[PDB]
Design a protein around this ligand. Structure first.
Ligand SMILES: O=C(O)c1cc(C(=O)O)c(NCc2ccccc2)cn1
Ligand SMILES: [Mn+2]
Length: 229
């Protein structure tokens, strides 16, 4: 079944019906008028960030460094040879002029943490970037600015059917390939219930703390995640 969509729910409505019980929801009408929604093009990103060094994941992922200009030329526009992903980078601490184009969702103030401790990551890459099914240790607002993303969500109650890796460093990551699972090795995965959605520009997906999520970009995509408690 699909993640529910609510237009600008009250802080109390969000707190009681989603944050406290830990239920995913897509928030409409919240981020859809942030300046990033109309301003962020490849052209704007190149103008404001082109010459800055960014970390890039190259898909068995390896990690390298290059300028934003280099990243767009090699992994976005010029019939890329491999998949490059400007992933989980605090681009707005590096480039404060870009932080003017976003805000922190008001719903974050329902958390128990300081606003200064909210981690804001950029997720900028071509069509076809894929995450492993994984869980994070904080709440998350994932804001879609450019393009769409297909996302699959499994509650923490279903962890047993997701076969987490046995190593400590990877215990938060599933061994299963969500979209082509090995049911001979991971048979419990097939009957695990889940929510899914296509997240589109202007929309905010609330991923509850420790909720397992899987993310595949359907187009050239730019997302901003807010990790908060
Ligand atoms: O908001 C999040 O918590 C979040 C969003 C994404 C995302 O892709 O948008 C994500 N993917 C991780 C990844 C994917 C491909 C290569 C290397 C890392 C992880 N976490
Ligand atoms: Mn994540």
């Amino acid at each position: 079944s699909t993640v529910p969509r609510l237009h600008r729910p009250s802080l109390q409505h969000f707190r009681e019906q989603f944050l406290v019980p830990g239920r995913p929801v897509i928030l409409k009408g919240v981020a859809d008028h942030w300046p990033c929604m109309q301003k962020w093009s490849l052209e704007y990103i190149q103008e404001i960030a082109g010459c800055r060094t960014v970390p890039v994941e190259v898909g068995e992922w390896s990690q390298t460094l290059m300028t934003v200009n280099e990243f767009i030329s090699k992994y976005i526009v010029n019939e890329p040879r491999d998949v490059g992903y400007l992933a989980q980078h605090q681009l707005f601490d590096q480039i404060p002029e870009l932080k003017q184009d976003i805000s922190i969702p008001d719903y974050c103030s329902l958390g128990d943490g300081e606003e200064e401790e909210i981690t804001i990551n950029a997720w900028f890459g071509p069509q076809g970037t894929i995450s492993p099914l994984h869980q994070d240790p904080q709440q998350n607002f994932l804001v879609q600015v450019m393009g769409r993303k297909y996302i699959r969500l499994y509650s923490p109650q279903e962890s047993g059917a997701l076969y987490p890796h046995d190593t400590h460093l990877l215990h938060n990551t599933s061994q299963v390939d969500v979209e082509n699972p090995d049911l001979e090795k991971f048979p419990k995965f097939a009957k695990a219930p889940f929510l899914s959605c296509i997240l589109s520009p202007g929309e905010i997906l609330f991923i509850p703390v420790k909720y397992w999520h899987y993310v595949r970009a359907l187009d050239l995509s730019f997302s901003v995640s807010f990790w908060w408690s």
